[PDB]
């Protein structure tokens, strides 16, 4: 088989979207509150997540059909999926040699111990690192990495979503281009689609654990005051 | 509600 | 005349309170989002104001009788007076030679042009610098500088204040210790009390202009997102 | 309301 012109255009739009929103130089990281190694890493990691939310929003706006959804559906999709998209895009800086997210220099190299200094426990950090290792070992083509982030974002099974039918038709079409892409373009990829779909289920589990950890810090005003207004909006519980 | 989110989602 | 033991104890408590909350080394400034010289200075100056609000709160908690007020009256007093106390305590870093706030190194030296890079116009910055120059020329003893900040904070004529009678009795007693202090301890200070009281009226005018400027940036979500949660609470319009 | 302010004003 061969993939069509429509499926090819979807791929081009999604990889362009990612290149426009993921900065491989990590040059804006110098603008965050500096890393410090009680909760010494929270200011820096809150600025990092806030910055990453902005990029996820930018990325989502460029996904074919996302802008056509109501502002309420776009908001419901981003509030539920943002942390899962952050965990996926972070895989690009994750290093198997160091078991850490390496964003250029040693100042922006984050290990398990650095993340516990932002208030997280091993209940989240152990499955998070296991997920990063597992994802990295899949050796995803950039086309597959960007489709997985778009599939994750366009999931209709999220709280507060109204146009379920439309969102499912968008996700289904993306899943079709991914399966076709793996089959035609990825040599030895016969079990890959099933593996990527399983990573989406691992992400639901990570999102749950993350929501518990976020509730723990957001309920302590001395810690929630270190977050940014965008993190408070997106990880918050308000309903539109 | 979602003041920042609405603005970042514009155009 | 001579000042009493009660008035002496008030003075000691207020100067101790200031030394505990004003860091002459400016060593925490390295932890803010770095200064950058559209609205390039906003991240740094929002972190500076957020930090300064925390210090004003700490200072207020140590003013004799402030802790005895209801949480609602403490909140009403801080929301109205915070920016005026920030403008007063900032006088300690203000330099007449540079017409700028000098907080150690050139990175933490703020001139009129740096502040316009946080979204402020000359409508506020011209009277603000004129006030800083005027205050600095008064050559206030540290005892007088700390009494003026406490008098400013304990002003009963603020919106949302309930126990007006109690707050006025606290401010009156502070005004009495200031007049007595100037008369007995400040040589050639016969016109000083009247000058310091006028600075309080200049501060009401600056607070007005500042509220307009803050409304202008807080109404633009791309700019309000650069503020911290504590700045949004304290400069916000919510009523308790 | 004033979640951070209440906490910073405690004790
Ligand atoms: C966000 C990106 C994308 C760009 C680069 O690849 C670097 C990167 C790393 C992400 C990491 C390493 C640090 C800790 C984080 C960012 C984790 C992903 C999730 C985790 C959390 C759990 O700490 C997020 C969080 O919720 N933080 C709190 C402190 C608000
Ligand atoms: C806050 C302190 C105390 C400790 C030191 O002495 C330094 C200092 C300086 C204060 C300044 C110099 C920068 C601009 C400010 C801090 C101004 C006081 C008011 C002004 C404003 C108008 O910009 C505040 C403001 O509202 N900022 C916006 C960006 C949120």
Numbering used by the authors:
A (entry chain A), C (entry chain A): 154 to 190, 251 to 453
B (entry chain B), D (entry chain B): 686 to 696
Q: Which of the paper's sentences describe this entry?
A:
In this study, a series of 20S(OH)D3 analogs with modified side chains were chemically synthesized. The crystal structures of 20S(OH)D3, 4 and 33 analogs in complex with the Danio Rerio VDR (zVDR) LBD were determined and compared to those of 1,20S(OH)2D3 and 1,25(OH)2D3 VDR complexes. Co-crystal structures of VDR in complex with 20S(OH)D3, 4, and 33 revealed notable differences in their molecular interactions in the binding pocket of VDR, which will be insightful for developing novel VDR agonists as anti-inflammatory agents.
Two analogs (4 and 33) were chosen to co-crystalize with the VDR to decipher their differential modes of interaction in comparison with 20S(OH)D3 and 1,25(OH)2D3. Similarly, the D3-like structure 33 having a 23-amide modification was obtained from the the photochemical opening of the B-ring. Analogs 4 and 33 cause conformational changes in the position of His305 and His397 with quite a substantial change in the case of 33 which formed a hydrogen bond between His397 and the amide group which is in contrast to 20S(OH)D3 which does not interact with this residue. While the exact relationship between these conformational changes induced by 33 and VDR function remain to be elucidated, the change indicates the possibility of producing analogs that display a unique subset of the actions seen for 1,25(OH)2D3 (i.e. are biased agonists), as already seen to some degree for the parental 20S(OH)D3. All analogs tested except 33 were metabolized by CYP27B1. 20S(OH)D3 and 33 displayed similar catalytic efficiencies which were the lowest of the analogs tested and 13-fold lower than for 13.
